[PDB]
Amino acid sequence: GHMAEKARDSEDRMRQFITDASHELRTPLTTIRGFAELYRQGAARDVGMLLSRIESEASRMGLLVDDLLLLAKL
Amino acid sequence: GHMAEKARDSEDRMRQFITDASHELRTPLTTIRGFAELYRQGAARDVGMLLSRIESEASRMGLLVDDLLLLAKL
Ligand SMILES: [K+]
Numbered sequence: 001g002h003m004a005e006k007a008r009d010s011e012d013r014m015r016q017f018i019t020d021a022s023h024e025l026r027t028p029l030t031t032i033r034g035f036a037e038l039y040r041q042g043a044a045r046d047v048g049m050l051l052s053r054i055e056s057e058a059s060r061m062g063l064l065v066d067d068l069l070l071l072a073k074l
Numbered sequence: 075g076h077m078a079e080k081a082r083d084s085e086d087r088m089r090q091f092i093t094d095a096s097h098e099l100r101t102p103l104t105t106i107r108g109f110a111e112l113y114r115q116g117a118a119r120d121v122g123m124l125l126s127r128i129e130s131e132a133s134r135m136g137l138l139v140d141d142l143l144l145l146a147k148l
Contacts, residue, residue, distance in 0.1 A: 004077035011081040014088050018146040021092070025099070025139045029132060032106075036129040039122075047121060054128060055110050061135075062103045065096050072092040 021068055028057035028064075091145055095138050102131035 035050050044050050106128050113124045 007078035007081035011085040015146045022142040033132040039125045068096045
């Protein structure tokens with residue numbers, strides 16, 4: 001009973017963390033992918049701003065990933 | 075007992091996957107920012123290749139993120 005229920009609680013918190021953590025990664029990515037696809041469709045007048053925003057989200061994502069890497073040890 | 079053992083083994087496998095996914099995301103993020111910098115500095119030609127490389131890295135990152143989401147549900 002008790003060890004299984006605590007282990008299951010611990011495992012469920014790990015699932016929910018991975019779900020939240022991954023959706024958080026999803027949002028910068030969808031921007032990176034969308035802005036690159038806008039370019040391939042012919043729609044970019046200013047690839048400088050497009051690239052800047054891409055770079056911004058890549059950096060944001062990099063901070064999320066380093067924090068995951070650390071949190072996975074805890 | 076056996077029920078805690080499997081909750082824990084399941085949790086530990088999820089933990090290892092976070093780690094491995096997070097490392098695998100770190101690299102495309104590095105590629106995108108390294109290539110962006112080279113292009114901004116005048117060191118490369120064919121911005122269409124830059125944007126297509128970013129699209130490919132982003133789609134690979136999307137696959138890793140969806141793996142995490144699926145693993146959390148299974
Ligand atoms: K933990």
